[PDB]
Design a protein around this motif. Structure first.
Motif, short mmCIF file in Angstrom:
data_model
loop_
_atom_site.label_atom_id
_atom_site.label_comp_id
_atom_site.label_asym_id
_atom_site.label_seq_id
_atom_site.Cartn_x
_atom_site.Cartn_y
_atom_site.Cartn_z
N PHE A 28 50.88 33.47 39.48
CA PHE A 28 50.86 32.54 38.35
C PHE A 28 49.56 32.64 37.56
CE2 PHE A 28 54.74 29.96 38.70
CZ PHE A 28 55.22 30.43 39.91
N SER A 29 48.46 32.92 38.25
CA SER A 29 47.17 33.06 37.60
C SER A 29 47.17 34.32 36.74
CB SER A 29 46.05 33.14 38.65
OG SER A 29 44.78 33.35 38.05
N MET A 68 44.52 38.52 42.03
CA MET A 68 44.82 38.73 40.61
C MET A 68 44.42 40.13 40.17
SD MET A 68 44.09 35.34 41.22
CE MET A 68 42.49 34.85 40.64
N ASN A 69 43.29 40.62 40.67
CA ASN A 69 42.80 41.95 40.34
C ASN A 69 43.72 43.08 40.79
OD1 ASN A 69 40.54 41.09 38.90
ND2 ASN A 69 39.20 41.13 40.70
N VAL A 135 40.95 32.94 31.03
CA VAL A 135 40.56 33.86 32.09
C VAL A 135 41.11 33.40 33.44
CG1 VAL A 135 38.35 32.64 32.19
CG2 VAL A 135 38.54 34.82 33.32
N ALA A 136 41.48 34.36 34.28
CA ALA A 136 42.00 34.07 35.61
C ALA A 136 40.80 33.90 36.53
CB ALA A 136 42.88 35.21 36.10
N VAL A 137 40.80 32.84 37.33
CA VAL A 137 39.70 32.58 38.24
C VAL A 137 40.22 32.09 39.58
CG1 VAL A 137 38.07 32.00 36.39
CG2 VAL A 137 39.43 30.19 37.45
N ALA A 138 39.44 32.31 40.62
CA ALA A 138 39.79 31.86 41.96
C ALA A 138 38.92 30.64 42.24
CB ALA A 138 39.51 32.94 42.97
N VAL A 139 39.47 29.65 42.94
CA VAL A 139 38.73 28.45 43.27
C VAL A 139 39.06 27.98 44.68
CG1 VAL A 139 38.62 27.55 40.90
CG2 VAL A 139 40.53 26.90 42.37
N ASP A 140 38.30 27.01 45.16
CA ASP A 140 38.52 26.40 46.45
C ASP A 140 39.31 25.16 46.06
OD1 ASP A 140 38.39 24.80 48.78
OD2 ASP A 140 36.45 25.64 49.33
N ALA A 209 36.21 35.73 38.54
CA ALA A 209 36.80 35.59 37.22
C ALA A 209 37.18 36.96 36.65
CB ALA A 209 35.82 34.90 36.28
N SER A 210 38.36 37.04 36.05
CA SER A 210 38.83 38.30 35.47
C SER A 210 39.93 38.06 34.44
CB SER A 210 39.32 39.26 36.55
OG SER A 210 40.41 38.72 37.28
#
Length: 215
Positions: A28-29, A68-69, A135-140, A209-210
């Motif tokens: 989804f990201s 995502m990458n 931008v697509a980002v990963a989070v906690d 972030a990407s």
């Protein structure tokens, strides 16, 4: 770098989706990002397929997670840079099970030539987002289960475990914040969205972030 920017105001963001009981957040990201980049590339806002990734992206693990990458590289190197529309490949992993990959009977909604990884710095990420878009980002997201609304000023920032879309920011507010699009239905948070404090690496928002590049 403007004081504030909300890509939703420019109609560059699609409606909030539901991932169900499938750990397909990464999909989804990645897709949410492509949808926005596609629009920004001078094309109509089109709902793309997350299922394409969940079912066909074999470099990731569908409902058991993914990056995502990896998703971006798979689209380019394995699917000739094509991303199907959601209409052609509806989401059906809600129950937690991903149906096998179907090679045909789909229409391409967007294409990307690659992707760029943004520096691990909120200021730099903001500058890029302000010009190039979401931008697509990963989070906690460990503390996200209890999020009901308002700007989250304290967020558990220990381990990355969720993928989301960064749609904007506001530095003019009392507490500068990021505007994040989640994929847990409109019933969660502020109509499917969440606002976290900006500038203190809340939820480790600057770590991964990407964005995809249309070209």
């Amino acid at each position: 770098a403007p004081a504030a920017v909300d890509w939703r105001a420019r109609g560059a963001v699609t409606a909030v989706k539901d991932q169900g009981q499938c750990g397909s957040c990464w999909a989804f990201s990645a897709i949410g990002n492509v949808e926005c980049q596609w629009f920004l590339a001078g094309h109509p806002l089109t709902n793309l397929s997350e299922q394409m990734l969940v079912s066909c992206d074999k470099t990731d693990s569908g409902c058991s997670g993914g990056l995502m990458n990896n998703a971006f590289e798979w689209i380019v190197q394995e699917n000739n840079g094509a991303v199907y529309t959601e209409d052609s490949y509806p989401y059906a992993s809600g129950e937690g099970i991903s149906p096998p990959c179907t090679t045909s009977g789909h229409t391409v909604g967007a294409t990307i030539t690659g992707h760029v990884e943004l520096p691990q710095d909120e200021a730099q990420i903001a500058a890029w987002l302000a010009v190039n878009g979401p931008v697509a980002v990963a989070v906690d997201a460990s503390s996200w289960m209890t999020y009901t609304g308002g700007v989250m000023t304290s967020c558990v920032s220990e381990q990355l475990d969720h993928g989301v879309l960064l749609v904007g920011y506001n530095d003019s507010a009392a507490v500068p914040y990021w505007i994040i699009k989640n994929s847990w239905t409109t019933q969660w948070g502020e109509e499917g969205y969440i606002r976290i404090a900006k500038g203190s690496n809340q939820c480790l928002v600057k770590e991964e972030a990407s964005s995809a590049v249309v070209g």
